[PDB]
Amino acid sequence: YCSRIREGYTEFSLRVEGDPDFYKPGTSYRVTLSAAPPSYFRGFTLIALRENREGDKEEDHAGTFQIIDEEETQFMSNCPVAVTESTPRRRTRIQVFWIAPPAGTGCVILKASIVQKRIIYFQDEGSLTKKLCEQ
């Protein structure tokens, strides 16, 4: 189940539109993964984890992703809680909804990994990682 299993900034950014300071349970947020020019990615993986969890357990994964662009993104065949590319084409941006979990879920870490001509692995902090807490 889910594998899946260098901080600071690369040219790839994981953002939430509107730059929320915290999440509100049940609110849909538009999560974006983008490459600064002239970079691109041919593949990506995107997850949302309760803080300080590895992701090896189902209950580590927080909230619900919803596909916006079916031809660009899909759920991972062998990690159904992870968003990934539909085909290995060069892309500079993808977007998905993330629906925030119930009150009491605690801090959530949205995290991405990409491939261009090298792999950028998941990191605890950095440009492909965003922490959102309740409040």
Provide the residue range defining the domain that includes 77. 1-135
CATH number for the domain spanning 22: value is 2.60.40.4060
Experimental method of this PDB entry: X-ray
Pairing of strands 28-35, 108-115: unpaired
In 3D, which of 50, 36, 66, 59 has the Cα closest to residue 128?
36
> What torsion do the CA atoms of 73, 30, 22, 114 make, to the nearest 10 degrees?
40
Q: Resolution of the coordinates in A?
A: 1.5
- In sequence order, which residues have a C-beta less than 8 Å from that of residue 24 and are 6 or more positions away? 100
Q: For the purposes of burial, counting CB atoms within 10 Å of the CB of 135, is it exposed (0-12), middle (13-18) or buried (19 or more)?
A: exposed
Residues 6+ apart with CB under 8 A from 117: none
Domain count, the chain: 1
Residue the block writes with tokens 């965003």:
130
Spatial separation of the C-alpha atoms in residues 29 and 89, rounded to whole Å = 25
